[PDB]
Amino acid sequence: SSFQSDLDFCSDCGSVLPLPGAQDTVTCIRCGFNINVRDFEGKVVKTSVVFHQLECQGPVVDRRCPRCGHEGMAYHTRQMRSADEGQTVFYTCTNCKFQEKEDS
Amino acid sequence: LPSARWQYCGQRAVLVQFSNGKLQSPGNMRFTLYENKDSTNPRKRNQRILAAETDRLSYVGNNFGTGALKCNTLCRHFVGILNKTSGQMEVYDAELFNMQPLFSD
Amino acid sequence: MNVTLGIPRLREILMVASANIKTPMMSVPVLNTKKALKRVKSLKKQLTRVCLGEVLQKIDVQESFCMEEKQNKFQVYQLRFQFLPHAYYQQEKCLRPEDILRFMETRFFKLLMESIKKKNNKRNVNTRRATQRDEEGHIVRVQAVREIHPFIDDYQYDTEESLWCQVTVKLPLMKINFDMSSLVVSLAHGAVIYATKGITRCLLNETTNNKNEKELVLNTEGINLPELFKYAEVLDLRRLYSNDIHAIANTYGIEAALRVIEKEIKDVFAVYGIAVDPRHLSLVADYMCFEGVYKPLNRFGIRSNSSPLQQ
Amino acid sequence: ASYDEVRGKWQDAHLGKDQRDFNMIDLKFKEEVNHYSNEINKACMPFGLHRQFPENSLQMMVQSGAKGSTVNTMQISCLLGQIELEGRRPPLMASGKSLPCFEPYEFTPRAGGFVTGRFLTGIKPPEFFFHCMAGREGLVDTAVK
Amino acid sequence: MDPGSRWRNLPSGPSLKHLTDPSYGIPREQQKAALQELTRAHVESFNYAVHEGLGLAVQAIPPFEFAFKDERISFTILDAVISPPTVPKGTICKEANVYPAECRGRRSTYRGKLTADINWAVNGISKGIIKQFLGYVPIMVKSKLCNLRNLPPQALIEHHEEAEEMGGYFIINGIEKVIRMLIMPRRNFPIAMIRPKWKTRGPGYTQYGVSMHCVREEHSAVNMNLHYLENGTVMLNFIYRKELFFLPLGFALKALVSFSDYQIFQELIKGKEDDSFLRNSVSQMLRIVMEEGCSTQKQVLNYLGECFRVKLNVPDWYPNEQAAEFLFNQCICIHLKSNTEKFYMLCLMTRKLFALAKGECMEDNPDSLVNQEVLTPGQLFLMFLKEKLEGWLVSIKIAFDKKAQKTSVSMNTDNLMRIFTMGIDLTKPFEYLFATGNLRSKTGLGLLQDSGLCVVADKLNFIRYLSHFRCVHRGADFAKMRTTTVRRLLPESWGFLCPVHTPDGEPCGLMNHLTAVCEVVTQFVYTASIPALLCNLGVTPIDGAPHRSYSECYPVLLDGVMVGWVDKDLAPGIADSLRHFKVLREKRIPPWMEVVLIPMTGKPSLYPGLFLFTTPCRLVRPVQNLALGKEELIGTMEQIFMNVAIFEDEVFAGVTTHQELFPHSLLSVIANFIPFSDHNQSPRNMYQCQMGKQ
Amino acid sequence: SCPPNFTAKPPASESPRFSLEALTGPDTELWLIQAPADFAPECFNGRHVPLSGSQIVKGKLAGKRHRYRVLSSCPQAGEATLLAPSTEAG
DNA sequence: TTAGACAAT
DNA sequence: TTGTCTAA
Ligand SMILES: [Zn+2]
Ligand SMILES: [Zn+2]
Structure with a gap:
């Protein structure tokens, strides 16, 4: 006449057993079914919080740098104006990394 | 690769679904089932109530009210027996009852 | 590392005359001798801060239940910290893990017990908050840890390679359900040790050079100017610099925070390729430091002016 | 390692809260397909043109500073090159398909935006969608800020 | 290509012969079935919202019962109809019908008479039925209520219209105004969000959370929320007339079902059964309910209708249990009828939150088109008309209370029919929404914006006039923000929104336009046989146990109805069977x-399941299913897992399962008029698309 | 305290005995077949069912309905248990 | 030492 | 949206 449930619930109704308190048996509320407080010795709850577990700068074009005079500069495009005109080209030198922009 | 001769023989064997846990320790527990009077209209074919007498609580199981499960209407439930010497899995119509303990009003 | 770019850096230079900017750096070259490089490779580690969430791999909380008398009932809270190994950080204050365990055993447990006694002195309600908060018109040592508090009943620390820690904060029973793991997480975002006053991060991997001179630069991210004056035998403090106008204005002077306003406006305009001539910048820096203090150009800077029609 | 395990570890570099091992894999396609982007332009831009400077009009508008640059004409008569979207390759979906034409976590450079088709002979509909992502990026970033 | 696929009439090349023929200028005897596909989403949505949806939206208005002086008066609408536009009574004319061309030329509104069957009853006994003229509502042209329905082109020229007249537009004071299709969140679906703004909504909230946009038969619309907390407790927040309600999860799950607490425990831990923190947290949610002694369902309903009673504005004579099922029927999962299926939906929305918070499933992107659908003009008519009917009944109550002050003779009515005449007339409060675009509703209609609804169908040419019927507007509130994430072209819009066809200024990225192939689902059919169909396949339902363990089974969500648990080794065999x-x-x-x-x-990908969507108001587009050779309407979330191909060269065996119809299907209508679009740079195409509209 | 132990049922009443057996020993093996809704219970009347793996077994309903797949599972320790009416107890 | 108040694009 | 000014 006994049912196997989780230890946190009554085994005759299905209702929730309260926390242990100032007595030696914890009882359900809606039926009055006493269970030993001593039976919660295997009520173990684990929780693990894991904090911390376990280039060539684009294509090049053979353009001379303003500062260092290197023969090539890496380029990147970005259409920064409206859709009416242009395409703004960003350059970056290979050696000394001097970045200038052209607006066409 | 075992086989079994499917010998459908026909009565509706009840199956129980406890809302408390598994009935793992059977003892002195009385089971009685109830059926509606008017078998004329086709609602009597589903009206059935199973009652469970225990000294502590009483468990009741419907087929129609709120909380009656939908597994035995959107799907059929059968029971195999498999008389092993003869090797025939003889099959009965069955129902599943989700029992709920009765308290008060 | 990053700085503040665009208009709002120029706003917080000119329009605000900000005493508290976000991300101030400072920059000191290294003396570039043999002993100074050896000392400064460790000084890079020493001037950083280290938070506890930086070297901690995982926290393990194992709440249990314990009843030992007819009255005494106890909630066993076996906290366990797994620290990340020493090989996975060679950037922070030479933290051999006995140092972070000493952090633990000295002050982290008291920092934890103050939080537990703040919470234990004590969302589950139907609140119906009366606003949504965001018109008809007709137009259209184990003994030290045990004596920290009586609640700590067990202590076990790792000894061979000092990578973990175990306590047992044995609280009594209470009516609410206690949220231990939230306290242990939110308390474990506190700074460990040797966090220098206001300096977060240092980088001397900027080995930049104009004449292949290998001029190592402590490109820090924090603002403490007399912090670096003890390291004069290693750093070349003669060509020190910062972003902050007020820090050098209170350390070196209004004539040396007059040549930092000019350099910073030139750097903000020079990120974006714009070349502003130095005569304009020198005129602005000689206007703002005219009264001897670093004034803004806002509404609260025209109260100094004389003619009220312009005001 | 076989391609199933490599595809598994790039699925694992994806789908994670770090996004620091994954952005590194962007910078290893994008530095290796920008070695096939320079070799084609050395094959076709100086001495591969039909009519050359000064007899070429477009080279005279480019090189004498009238309009354009040697990036617009390399997009006209050679590849469009890598599509960089917000500094990186265009985004994978929630299923690892970078675009519904392509297999989940496909290794080919075409799958991640390397266009390699010019405007002189047109671009196929995957690269046209990638190029419209890159156009709307700049247009939105101008229109907002 | 499959015959019958709407795109079998696609020409191989242009002809230019149709402008030098004897047949030119003779009207054809039927309209063209290519220009009429462009207002299906407008006309077929307004056809639902006047006959079927109005009959299903007067069933969901409760019997309005208030208190007379010691008598209870019950009002209920039985059936409301919208008559097609005619002349007013007392007019000497020859043809009683009114056509749109009169309403354009005379600068009037093209509108239809609205009337209903209100069934008044005092003290529980009926004493009459009244057929009451509520007001006038606008009529969409070429719908089932316009007078131009079912006309041939030669009889349509005769009434001053055009041949190939597609409808879709309301004449409001002489100015034609379309309703633009906004973007709404995907209806009846748990959208797992990670939004750190939600941390400030309570004392222990997390950045995590699962939202749901619930809609009940195209006439109601309510957003709900779930929140994971620092404890492991789950809250549940929902606004009801500008009142943010806080409701814990266990209170909801106990107020819904009559189950014992071990079953409510069991339903929330199905996949994660070896987790200790999870079982602890879903114990604590139920214990919070236990703390007030609310052990039964009736006692939970008593407590909830005790605490929430004053803000739900229920009458003084309801019990607490009756004002508790007034907030589970009109706020929480209203697309479901039964409280049993509301329960197993909150269990799935809770397990998705528990898998999100533990990092076992990734965020569903709210701005992606996978998790989005459109708001057609059938929703915004029907929701607003339902709300104005409820406002009309509340105005009848205020009219009785105005009669009761300065106390009248105040006897029985006996078909008095003066309070209805003194009642409010919803001509002008229904005209204001179209004539300005401003939605002044006390509900909010479950929406996210307030203005920008009706936009003038401008007609400067025909390129501009097509575009208003293909416009998909992201939001008229995002134009003021400084965001870029909502304005980003994403690869999940391959063929459902056009890449090039957008404006360039402040609405760049917001006002998307549909493609050519993409079509909005407007048909509303009945999914009554599909649960039994699924369970005849491997779907073991909720109540029974699948025969492998859980976490080796998939949830099934048949339009917000939790159905069952497909075994994991039988889920492709149900997916391809439902596609066939x-x-x-x-x-x-x-x-x-x-x-x-x-x-x-096993990796933190999207939250797994076997989701099935049958709703209207979605986006769908045809492909060719390769293994069948037959045209398949792929939705927005199917093609994120399908290997569609473009060219017959790029089709492989084993890898490829579909193929687009014609390879320029990714482009709009307006962007399919640009010659050689693949040769010029893409802002040039994006500029031409808004040049041709000028 | 006061347990209910109900005996009240207004339209219902108890039952006579049926033809299902009562004796379960080592010779019987309880199988729990879960069949579809439109599964006619006479279809496999001469056919076999698998006890391990799966099998696509035919029926006799119309000859063309016959494709049924049978999934042979492991014991779940299922919570549904059988009630066999014994003849010693009325 | 920290919240309302006041002006600008 | 800043940033300082005023009052508790
Ligand atoms: Zn109990
Ligand atoms: Zn250079």
Whole structure:
């Protein structure tokens, strides 16, 4: 006449057993079914919080740098104006990394 | 690769679904089932109530009210027996009852 | 590392005359001798801060239940910290893990017990908050840890390679359900040790050079100017610099925070390729430091002016 | 390692809260397909043109500073090159398909935006969608800020 | 290509012969079936919202019962109809009908008479039925209520219209105004969000959370929320007339069902059974309910209708249990009828939150088109008209209270029919929404914006006039923000929104336009046989146990109805079986259904399941299913897992399962008029698309 | 305290005995077949069912309905248990 | 030492 | 949206 449930619930109704308190048996509320407080010795709850577990700068074009005079500069495009005109080209030198922009 | 001769023989064997846990320790527990009077209209074919007498609580199981499960209407439930010497899995119509303990009003 | 770019850096230079900017750096070259490089490779580690969430791999909380008398009932809270190994950080204050365990055993447990006694002195309600908060018109040592508090009943620390820690904060029973793991997480975002006053991060991997001179630069991210004056035998403090106008204005002077306003406006305009001539910048820096203090150009800077029609 | 395990570890570099091992894999396609982007332009831009400077009009508008640059004409008569979207390759979906034409976590450079088709002979509909992502990026970033 | 696919009439090349023929200028005897596909989403949505949806939206208005002086008066609408536009009574004319061309030329509104059957009853006994003229509502042209329905082009020229007249537009004071299709969140679906703004909504909230946009038969719309907390407790927040309600989860799950607490425990831990923190947290949610002694369902309902009673504005004579099922019927999962299926939906929305918070499933992107659908003009008519009917009944109550002050003779009514005459007339409060675009509703209609609804169908040319019927507007509130994430072209819009066809200024990225192939689902059919169909396949339902363990089974969500648990080794065999049932038009599967099989991989990918969508107001587009050779309506979330191909060269065996119809399907209508679009740079195409509209 | 132990049922009443057996020993093996809704219970009347793996077994309903797949599972320790009416107890 | 108040694009 | 000014 006994049912196997989780230890946190009554085994005759299905209702929730309260926390242990100032007595030696914890009882359900809606039926009055006493269970030993001593039976919660295997009520173990684990929780693990894991904090911390376990280039060539684009294509090049053979353009001379303003500062260092290197023969090539890496380029990147970005259409920064409206859709009416242009395409703004960003350059970056290979050696000394001097970045200038052209607006066409 | 075992086989079994499917010998459908026909009565509706009840199956129980406890809302408390598994009935793992059977003892002195009385089971009685109830059926509606008017078998004329086709609602009597589903009206059935199973009652469970225990000294502590009483468990009741419907087929129609709120909380009656939908597994035995959107799907059929059968029971195999498999008389092993003869090797025939003889099959009965069955129902599943989700029992709920009765308290008060 | 990053700085503040665009208009709002120029706003917080000119329009605000900000005493508290976000991300101030400072920059000191290294003396570039043999002993100074050896000392400064460790000084890079020493001037950083280290938070506890930086070297901690995982926290393990194992709440249990314990009843030992007819009255005494106890909630066993076996906290366990797994620290990340020493090989996975060679950037922070030479933290051999006995140092972070000493952090633990000295002050982290008291920092934890103050939080537990703040919470234990004590969302589950139907609140119906009366606003949504965001018109008809007709137009259209184990003994030290045990004596920290009586609640700590067990202590076990790792000894061979000092990578973990175990306590047992044995609280009594209470009516609410206690949220231990939230306290242990939110308390474990506190700074460990040797966090220098206001300096977060240092980088001397900027080995930049104009004449292949290998001029190592402590490109820090924090603002403490007399912090670096003890390291004069290693750093070349003669060509020190910062972003902050007020820090050098209170350390070196209004004539040396007059040549930092000019350099910073030139750097903000020079990120974006714009070349502003130095005569304009020198005129602005000689206007703002005219009264001897670093004034803004806002509404609260025209109260100094004389003619009220312009005001 | 076989391609199933490599595809598994790039699925694992994806789908994670770090996004620091994954952005590194962007910078290893994008530095290796920008070695096939320079070799084609050395094959076709100086001495591969039909009519050359000064007899070429477009080279005279480019090189004498009238309009354009040697990036617009390399997009006209050679590849469009890598599509960089917000500094990186265009985004994978929630299923690892970078675009519904392509297999989940496909290794080919075409799958991640390397266009390699010019405007002189047109671009196929995957690269046209990638190029419209890159156009709307700049247009939105101008229109907002 | 499949014959019957709407795109079999696509020309190989242009002809230029149709402008030098004897047949030119003779009207054809039927309209063109290519220009009439562009207002299906407008006309077929307004056709639902006047006959079927109005009959289903007067069933969901409760019997309005108030208190007379010691008598209870009950009002209920039985049936409301919208008559097609005629002349007013007392008019000497020859043809009683009114056509749109009169309403354009005379600068009037093209509108239809509205009337209803209100069934008044005092003290529980009926004493009459009244047929009451509520007001005038606008009529969409070429709908089932316009007078231009079913006309041939030669009889349509005769009434001053045009041949190939597609409807879709309201004449409001002489100015034609379309309703633009906004973007709304995907209806009846748990959208797992990670939004750190939600941390400030309570004392222990997390950045995590699962939202749901619930809509009940195209006339109601309510957003709800779930929140994971620092404890492991789950809250549940929902606004009801500008009142943010806080409701814990266990209170909801106890107020819904009569189950014992071990079953409510069991339903929330199905996949994660070896987790200790999870079982602890879903114990604590139920214990919070236990703390007040609310052990039964009736006692939980008593407590909830005790605490929430004053803000729900229920009458003084309801019990607490009756004002508790007034907030579970009109706020929480209103697309479900039964409280049993509301329960197993909150269990799935809770398990998705528990898998999100533990990092076992990734965020569903709210701005992606996978998790989005459109708000057609059938919703915004029907929701607003339902709300104005409820406002009309509340005005009748205020009219009785105005009669009771300065106390009248105040006897029985006896078909008095003066309070209805003194009642409010919803001509002008229904005209204001169209004539300005401003939605002044006390509900909010479950929406996210307030203005920008009706936009003038401008007609400067025909390129501009087509575009208003293909416009998909992201939001008229995002134009003020400084965001870029909502304005980003994403690869999930391959063929459902056009890449090039957008404006360039402040609305760049917001005002998207549909493609040519993409079409909005407007058909509303009945999914009554599909649960029994699924359970005849491997779907073991909720109550029984699948025969492998859980976490080796998939949830099934048949339009917000939790159905069952597909075994993991039988989920492809149900996905391809439902696709074969879809493209072959078998077994009452709609041809516009989604069979989305998000698989299990063990990595924190999308939250796995076998989702099935049958709703209206979605986006769908045809492909060719390669293994069948037949045209398949792929939805927005199916093609994120399908290997569609473009060219017959790029089709492989084993890898490829579909193929687009014609390879320029990704482009709009307006962007398919640019010659050689693949040769010029893409802002040039994006500029030409808004040049041709000027 | 006061347990209910109900005996009240207004339209219902108890039952006579039926033809299902009562004796379960080592010779019987309880199988729990879960069949579809439109599964006619006479279809496999001469056919076999698998006890391990799966098998696509035919029926006799119309000859063309016959494709049924049978999934042979492991014991779940299922919570549904059988009630066999014994003849010693009325 | 920290919250309302006041002006600008 | 800043940033300082005023009052508790
Ligand atoms: Zn109990
Ligand atoms: Zn250079």
